[PDB]
Amino acid sequence: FSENITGLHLGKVALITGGSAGIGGQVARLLALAGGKVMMVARRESELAVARARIVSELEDIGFAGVERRVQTLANVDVSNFESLKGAVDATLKAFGRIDYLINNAGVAGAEDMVVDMGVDAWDYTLDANLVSNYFLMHHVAPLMKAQGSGYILNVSSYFGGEKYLAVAYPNRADYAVSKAGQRAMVESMARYLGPEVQFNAIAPGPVDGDRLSGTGGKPGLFERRGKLILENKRLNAVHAAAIKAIRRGVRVEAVLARLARNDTVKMSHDTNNPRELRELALACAREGDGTCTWDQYLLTPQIAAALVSRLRQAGLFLDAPEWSERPVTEDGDWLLRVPPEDAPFLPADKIAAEAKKVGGGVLSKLYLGKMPTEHDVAQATVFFLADRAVSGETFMPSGGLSVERSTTERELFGSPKQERLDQMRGKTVWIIGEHLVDYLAETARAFIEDCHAANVVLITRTAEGFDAVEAQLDEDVAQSLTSLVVSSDIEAAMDEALSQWGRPTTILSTPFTALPGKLFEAQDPLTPDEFREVVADNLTHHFRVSRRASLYDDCQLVLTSPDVAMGDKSPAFALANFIKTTLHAFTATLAVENERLVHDVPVNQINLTRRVQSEEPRDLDEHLEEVRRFARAVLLVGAPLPDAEDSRYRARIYRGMSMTV
Amino acid sequence: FSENITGLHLGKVALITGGSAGIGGQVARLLALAGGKVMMVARRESELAVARARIVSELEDIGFAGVERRVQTLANVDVSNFESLKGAVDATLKAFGRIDYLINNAGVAGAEDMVVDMGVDAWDYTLDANLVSNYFLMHHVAPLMKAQGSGYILNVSSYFGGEKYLAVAYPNRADYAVSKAGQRAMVESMARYLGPEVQFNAIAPGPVDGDRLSGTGGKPGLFERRGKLILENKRLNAVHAAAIKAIRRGVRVEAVLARLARNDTVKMSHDTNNPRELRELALACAREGDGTCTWDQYLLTPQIAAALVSRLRQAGLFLDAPEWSERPVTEDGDWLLRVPPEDAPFLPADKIAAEAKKVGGGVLSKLYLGKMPTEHDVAQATVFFLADRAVSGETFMPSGGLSVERSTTERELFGSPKQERLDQMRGKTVWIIGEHLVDYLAETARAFIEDCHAANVVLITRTAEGFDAVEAQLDEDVAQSLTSLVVSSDIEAAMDEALSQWGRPTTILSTPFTALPGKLFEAQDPLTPDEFREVVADNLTHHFRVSRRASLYDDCQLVLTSPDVAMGDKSPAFALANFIKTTLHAFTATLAVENERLVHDVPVNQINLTRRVQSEEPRDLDEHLEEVRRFARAVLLVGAPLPDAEDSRYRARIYRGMSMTV
Secondary structure (H helix, E strand, C coil): CCCCCCCCCCCCEEEECCCCCHHHHHHHHHHHHCCCEEEEECCCHHHHHHHHHHHHHHHHHCCCCCCCCCEEEECCCCCCCHHHHHHHHHHHHHHHCCCCEEEECCCCCCCCCCHHHCCHHHHHHHHHHHHHHHHHHHHHHHHHHHHHCCEEEEEECCHHHCECCECCCCCCCHHHHHHHHHHHHHHHHHHHHHCCCEEEEEECCCCCECHHHHCCCCCCCHHHHHHHHHHHHHHHHHHHHHHHHHHHHCCCHHHHHHHHHCCCHHHHHHCCCCCHHHHHHHHHHHCCCCCCCCCCCCCCCHHHHHHHHHHHHHCCCCCCCHHHHHCCHHHCCCCCCCCCCCCCCCCCHHHHHHHHHHHHHHHHCCECCCCCCEHHHHHHHHHHHHHCCCCCCCEECCCCCECCCCCCCCEECCCCCCHHHHHHHCCCEEEEECCCCHHHHHHHHHHHHHHCCCCEEEEEECCHHHHHHHHCCCCHHHHCCEEEEECCCCHHHHHHHHHHHHCCCCEEEECCCCCCCCCCCCCCCCCCHHHHHHHHHHHHHHHHHHHHHHCCCCCCEEEEEECCCCCCCCCCHHHHHHHHHHHHHHHHHHHHHHHHHCCCCCCEEEEECCCCCHHHCCCCHHHHHHHHHHHHHHHHHHHCCCCCCCCCHHHHHHCCCCEEEC | CCCCCHHHCCCCEEEEECCCCHHHHHHHHHHHHCCCEEEEECCCHHHHHHHHHHHHHHHHHHCCCCCHHHEEEECCCCCCCHHHHHHHHHHHHHHHCCCCEEEECCCCCCCCCCHHHCCHHHHHHHHHHHHHHHHHHHHHHHHHHHHHCCEEEEEECCHHHCECCECCCCCCCHHHHHHHHHHHHHHHHHHHHHCCCEEEEEECCCCCECHHHHCCCCCCCHHHHHHHHHHHHHHHHHHHHHHHHHHHHCCCHHHHHHHHHHCCHHHHHHCCCCCHHHHHHHHHHHCCCCCCCCCCCCCCCHHHHHHHHHHHHHCCCCCCCHHHHHCCHHHCCCCCCCCCCCCCCCCCHHHHHHHHHHHHHHHHCCECCCCCCEHHHHHHHHHHHHHCCCCCCCEECCCCCECCCCCCECEECCCCCCHHHHHHHCCCEEEEECCCCHHHHHHHHHHHHHHCCCCEEEEEECCHHHHHHHHHCCCHHHHCCEEEEECCCCHHHHHHHHHHHHCCCCEEEECCCCCCCCCCCCCCCCCCHHHHHHHHHHHHHHHHHHHHHHCCCCCCEEEEEECCCCCCCCCCHHHHHHHHHHHHHHHHHHHHHHHHHCCCCCCEEEEECCCCCHHHCCCCHHHHHHHHHHHHHHHHHHHCCCCCCCCCHHHHHHCCCCEEEC
16 A cells, blocks of 8 residues: 555645644655655654654655655644744745645644633643644645645544534533534635635544554553543542532531541541531442542542632632632642542542443444544545545544434524523523623613513623613613623633622623624735634633633523624625534533533523524514524523423433524 | 556455446546456446546556456446346456445436426436435445455435535425435445445535536537526426416416417417416516527417426316316327427527526536536545545535535424414314324324314325224314325325315325334345335335425425334334435425425425434333424424515525424
């Protein structure tokens, strides 16, 4: 095979990110074997040098001439840094005088935390490395490709990013799932604008057989890694659930934490002045041991203990707690009166191996072709797809026929719920977060106050002016139930301040503060990579930042809103809104599954303000007012306290993680 | 080096149907150049010999040895002759000892008629040639491939068969669209059962640049072909619309036909004897001429006049017409008093050219890559895709980035219409067609009689026993409003009989008479091609046969039902149900568009009795009863008179061509 494809890519120049190892290294190798000139770029100098040297050795043996000039490298390329990526484009052009193929392969695993535990810096890094980087390179290379009359851009996405019209939950990996869904969503929404010259496609492999998956050197394989995190998250969730259940029954949070601080299951199981929830928790923990590990004798490690107090803090459960209300966040790891010894594992390796075999079997059982593709299999597929000249705007699936069955699909709304369900809102508080979507914010505030008899709508805005514009659209009597909170630092601070001032919300509606830009690849005024990074911040990170607090609130429903497009607009804003709708659905689907595992059980649903077909967008005032009314009906449908999940397995499922277009 | 890509297919054996010309011929050529062995099969020896000789010549040139034995042919192989397809499998095994790739390429354009004008024989010819032929070959080759441990089946579908979760209307081509959608739906629902050994994928090109599209000899190009059919259908629809509107005002059908038979635009324009609808039609036709063509002087050719009277007959409009009732169907083309002269064209060559430019321009404007792909471009893409080993269950799109925007996605139902809209059913007649789905037919009859106050539900069944079973589930008071009609010849005659006896229906619900088989590729007891053909007859043709009459009924709503799967079943019935759901959605989408062009304006919607995810199927009695009640609410949602397009453009679109799963 490897010596008999010299004709497939002869003279084509490729820039490949993450080109030192895995799929990227194999794609670099096979493009070179196929006659291509390759600039391989990566962070690690040594891996990259060894990889390129093996490729050049093979090119000699199949009798290419001039083999050193055919495969070039650039190390210390950090895809989270714009200046570093620009160096990769400059190096490709200096070496080869053009770029034919851009292969957006570099990727990080990301935070590997539940949304409620995930830092904003970790989230931002994942989105910067995995998604914004791809747009940065597209911005710089697409004009070069258009000017020469041809090019190909390929995004290396993941099965876990979902597929067109079908989102997929990836619990513990929301940052990763969003970044991968985004790489595909770019292909779906932007390929129109890269044509006619540039083909723009994705690949979406699932798990891939090689050193990284198997584990090499000292390193756990990926299923063993996932399994160990599953158990850590299970212990955190269990300790947290017991603490919350005790606090709901009216045990003081300081009493719960003083009792957890003793960190001794034996003593907690039977000591009668531990609340029932902590006794039940300690008994259950005491049955999970193997005779070597310590998690059967200690409830918590410092790391799980720190994550626990962060969850209690962010739910506002320390507001009235004298000590905990002012303790420095820096000390969240230091409050246990005893810690597991460092000479023994916390977790049992048998339970880790069983979690890993369940992950592994769960994938293997879903493959039509019965075995996971290798890195070489996926790279081979990639190099074959790169030779086609008729495909654009598609995602290829070199996964082994990976088939995860789910019904998390974009729905157009036409329907409603009972007046008895809406009447449960009477006297309650709701939060609406927004700025520019004044008609939608106003009609929703009106529906909650006038139709559902909510006592208080807290309108959280970027500016006083944004508040005034919505208030001006309400009747004076309805406006007396609207409260203003203007963001002064960040949205999480504003949500903490709303919770502190006016209490626990029943419904949180999250809308973007800013309208989408009306540009993308236009030579006169293109969307710059900094402006695209802002689009991601305003339309994806914003909802993550609201979600990570809202998911900690008992009896609250969370509603996320994707962007609108101004009536009569004919710009790429419509493409950008569909890009966000797809990418946010990965978030909504994943968070709906994580939240069902948390004691707070917060439902999350998405409402879309842009339709899939631009000609079906509202085209006159009657249609605009119809959509504004439909939007508020959709918010009530997923925002009002939900009917019984025990009622119906089918209906239970429809109200978690839906994406509904109005 | 330049053109060596043997590593791709060296030694791989392909059987290609329609392998002498177009894409098929270019796939044969490019597989051979990539080191593959090919059996090219087609009807004409002369064409096969030219194609084979050209390939063998190019192989000699680029330096292959033993080239004669690498490219073989078999003539008289026609996808409408299944015995000849089996011979092509035998020939491939005799020549090469094995088969690696089956390329299901051959196909026909089909009837090129609106559903209301299409014969059952023409429909069956298309589905047998384009879809059942592919299953026939899969049935024979899959066991060979499974036994050798590897293989690839590739169905050559069409963009106009749709894509996963998104149906596309293809008006005047419903037979073709269904066949192409079926090729894809087999890939989506059956790849699981061809794995792990066999990869099963499709390609879905749109229009392809070559001799067939351009046209050769004096043979019109495809766009010119389509343009002339558009004019002939426009004339038939306009004459039909005027006749129906005159009949709705109370002009006797006899009188309308006697005026049309004069077939003189200038006379019909001005004469006061003629109803206003015929005057307006005559005036409009008179303004359409070019000074050469005759369609401005004559309303009708014999062919269009035959199609017109067939539409009136099938609507029951001759029931009280003494002459026309009894006229033999043989004489439908003989009733005009004057016919256009043979020496001059009926249609204007210039308006055909304009419709052809409009069709062509429409396609071109939707191509991301700006240029229609050539046969060579599509064949090259196919040969690259066939080298991949990690993809199964997917449709590749080597179309030039063809993107037809539509919102025809499968939707899971949750919502309701106002009681006021259900109340318009009071006193009306509903037809329910079915046999095996007793619980669903019973709840639906009860919902129409008890909840909507329908006067009469005509239950059209295969047997008296099937009627008795539904009647047994109803309260005696409800059953008083249920009428039996047992099919004695065909469903179209049962519909004519029900219309004649009990009058025009407001709602027609079409359910299949037979349950799906519980088998597919199992070595012990596979689904035979003949049994697969009966699945197609029972679950696709059955609905076509109902639809071709229902679509001619004023103020009637049509509802098509896709198959259920018995609770607790674990067979391939579930795969067959999802295959039908996808394939019937192509019919539902296309018929919804055609029917809006007809004067009768009959809405059509689809309801699915099987979910996409097998774990989400009803598991117990409570879930079964919940689904039965939800099915009847879905039938009412799309079966009761819809609210005006004028009331809401968005709502009007939802309620036409939908696929709703309960």
